[PDB]
Design a binder for this molecule. Sequence first.
Ligand SMILES: *[C@@H]1O[C@H](CO)[C@@H](O[C@@H]2O[C@H](CO)[C@@H](O[C@@H]3O[C@H](CO[C@H]4O[C@H](CO)[C@@H](O)[C@H](O[C@H]5O[C@H](CO)[C@@H](O)[C@H](O)[C@@H]5O)[C@@H]4O)[C@@H](O)[C@H](O[C@H]4O[C@H](CO)[C@@H](O)[C@H](O)[C@@H]4O)[C@@H]3O)[C@H](O)[C@H]2NC(C)=O)[C@H](O)[C@H]1NC(C)=O
Ligand SMILES: *[C@@H]1O[C@H](CO)[C@@H](O[C@@H]2O[C@H](CO)[C@@H](O[C@@H]3O[C@H](CO)[C@@H](O)[C@H](O[C@H]4O[C@H](CO)[C@@H](O)[C@H](O)[C@@H]4O)[C@@H]3O)[C@H](O)[C@H]2NC(C)=O)[C@H](O)[C@H]1NC(C)=O
Ligand SMILES: *[C@@H]1O[C@H](CO)[C@@H](O[C@@H]2O[C@H](CO)[C@@H](O)[C@H](O)[C@H]2NC(C)=O)[C@H](O)[C@H]1NC(C)=O
Ligand SMILES: *[C@@H]1O[C@H](CO)[C@@H](O)[C@H](O)[C@H]1NC(C)=O
Ligand SMILES: [Cu+2]
Ligand SMILES: [Cu+2]
Ligand SMILES: [Cu+2]
Ligand SMILES: [Cu+2]
Length: 499
Amino acid sequence: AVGPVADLTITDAAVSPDGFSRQAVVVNGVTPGPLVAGNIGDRFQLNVIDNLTNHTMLKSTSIHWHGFFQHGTNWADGPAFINQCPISPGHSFLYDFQVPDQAGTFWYHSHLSTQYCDGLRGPFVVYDPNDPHASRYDVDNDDTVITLADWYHTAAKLGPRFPGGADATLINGKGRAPSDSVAELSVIKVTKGKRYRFRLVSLSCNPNHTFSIDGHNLTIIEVDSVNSQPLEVDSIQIFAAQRYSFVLDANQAVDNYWIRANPNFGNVGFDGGINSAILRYDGAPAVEPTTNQTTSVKPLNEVDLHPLVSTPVPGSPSSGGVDKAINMAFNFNGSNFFINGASFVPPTVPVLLQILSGAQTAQDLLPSGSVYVLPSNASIEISFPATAAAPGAPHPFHLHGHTFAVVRSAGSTVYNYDNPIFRDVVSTGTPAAGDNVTIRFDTNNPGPWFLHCHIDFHLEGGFAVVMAEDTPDVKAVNPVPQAWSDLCPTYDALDPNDQ
Ligand SMILES: *[C@@H]1O[C@H](CO)[C@@H](O[C@@H]2O[C@H](CO)[C@@H](O[C@@H]3O[C@H](CO[C@H]4O[C@H](CO)[C@@H](O)[C@H](O[C@H]5O[C@H](CO)[C@@H](O)[C@H](O)[C@@H]5O)[C@@H]4O)[C@@H](O)[C@H](O[C@H]4O[C@H](CO)[C@@H](O)[C@H](O)[C@@H]4O)[C@@H]3O)[C@H](O)[C@H]2NC(C)=O)[C@H](O)[C@H]1NC(C)=O
Ligand SMILES: *[C@@H]1O[C@H](CO)[C@@H](O[C@@H]2O[C@H](CO)[C@@H](O[C@@H]3O[C@H](CO)[C@@H](O)[C@H](O[C@H]4O[C@H](CO)[C@@H](O)[C@H](O)[C@@H]4O)[C@@H]3O)[C@H](O)[C@H]2NC(C)=O)[C@H](O)[C@H]1NC(C)=O
Ligand SMILES: *[C@@H]1O[C@H](CO)[C@@H](O[C@@H]2O[C@H](CO)[C@@H](O)[C@H](O)[C@H]2NC(C)=O)[C@H](O)[C@H]1NC(C)=O
Ligand SMILES: *[C@@H]1O[C@H](CO)[C@@H](O)[C@H](O)[C@H]1NC(C)=O
Ligand SMILES: [Cu+2]
Ligand SMILES: [Cu+2]
Ligand SMILES: [Cu+2]
Ligand SMILES: [Cu+2]
């Protein structure tokens, strides 16, 4: 792992994770990029060096540190034209922030167009030397991070606007496309008798994945950086951008066992060993498993998750017992997504720069109809009713700068004002189940924070809004470095083909 103080060099390279060679966006030579790690309390100084040369995958870039509150450092959050102008090619920029009050499993990714889909994405872990779950496992390290990624043989800007699924699911950066079932698979080495904290991170641009391990159950103890009550399951459906820690007891027979991550669409199942990797106990031969999959009889259900430590829900025990309730009505017209009649188009001047330049009201802020001004020190409820009007369901919505209470989960008609799980990416379910997924949070974090579908192609088609939280305090609370002030002039000076 690198960090907390590190250079991250962004370049274009040839990679072949599934044996097919293509140009991708890589981080210190690799994709998924390297694990960034620190401890709770750390200051991170992550120097992002943009040495990109390929305009099709974008020569400019911007990195988001997914799940971090970034309190007082809203300028470092990453979304292009919300929190900064992109870094320009040939330049570097220092993201410099603290993580005083969080620990768990995160990730980092480009937040410029669909560039993370082209490879700029990797895992990010913040350890707790007082982790309340430490008694449950023996091993937690670089090799117990498990990444899932959808991989495409055509680049983001070159294929369909809304791809019908990936060529290959990669697990720790390797996997098979169904045409070449010879390509090397990832191996996750375990040792009989040891308990492992596996940190499962979905780096997905689009599909969700139903993750299982032949012969083993999984005890979930963390959900998107929030410590849970331990929950034993035999399969986990994990949506783009979500994270779970699970404990795996390596107390079965020394052998090879299939690791399975079946996407919701694209190449499904496991023929040829697609959608798979290998759990190899030490001593087992260097061969593919021959285990078979059994029916999941205890699948994860989000409603079954609860915080480890009692965490009151923001507001009061009633539908709309909050200071401000916002409903998000979805639409789609074949090319673009809309929220409450507005398809997001990034503004010329980043929302944060507009605020620092005096714009504190929805009337003054751009894009018009896409920015919701929130009062300070208030409870907020947001509902995302599933509708046939928004194909590509279930949409995993993400709120930057906050961890929220999921008061109503997909596939559940029930509202939990008592002990609902908190997380930062939530499936908004389907119109088939009449879902009306609802979240709550408190506005104690001044700044503009993106709220958007985490299917990158949908974000790109406009499926986003901005929550402009406590705009009158943004300037005082988030002092900006000169390097940040320099971004927009430099970017705006670029030829459009060097963007
Ligand atoms: C900027 O980044 C973008 C996004 O990735 C790059 O876009 C690529 O554009 C090229 C050229 O326009 C496209 O090439 C097409 O590629 C396909 C598939 O190619 C792959 O499969 C081959 C078959 O086995 C194999 O030879 C290739 O290997 C080479 O390429 C890789 C990757 O760079 C390299 O690592 C290797 O060393 C090899 O050099 C590769 O694995 C190919 O089939 C296409 O050909 C049909 O296409 C044309 C028109 O129909 C025709 O002339 C041919 O007869 C052929 O039948 C074509 O060459 C490519 O698909 C794009 N990549 C992606 C992921 O979308 C762009 O290249 C980058 N620019 C720079 C400067 O690198
Ligand atoms: C992961 O979780 C799943 C679900 O919780 C769990 O599956 C359960 O496994 C047990 C294995 O103990 C299954 O029950 C067995 O079923 C067989 C077939 O009917 C019976 O013959 C077994 O009886 C023998 O073994 C018992 C000990 O448990 C003796 O008490 C008994 O007298 C017999 O000798 C036994 O009942 C159970 O049905 C499943 N439940 C399902 C599928 O819902 C699985 O074991 C867990 N995996 C791991 C590795 O922990
Ligand atoms: C999903 O829940 C939201 C939030 O409760 C609902 O929107 C509210 O509906 C009632 C109408 O009976 C209004 O009084 C509230 O003011 C609404 N909030 C709005 C529109 O901002 C929504 O109706 C529910 N939708 C579905 C499909 O169940
Ligand atoms: C969908 O709406 C967008 C944004 O308003 C518009 O520019 C686009 O042309 C529309 N597309 C179709 C297919 O109607
Ligand atoms: Cu994200
Ligand atoms: Cu985020
Ligand atoms: Cu979506
Ligand atoms: Cu985001």
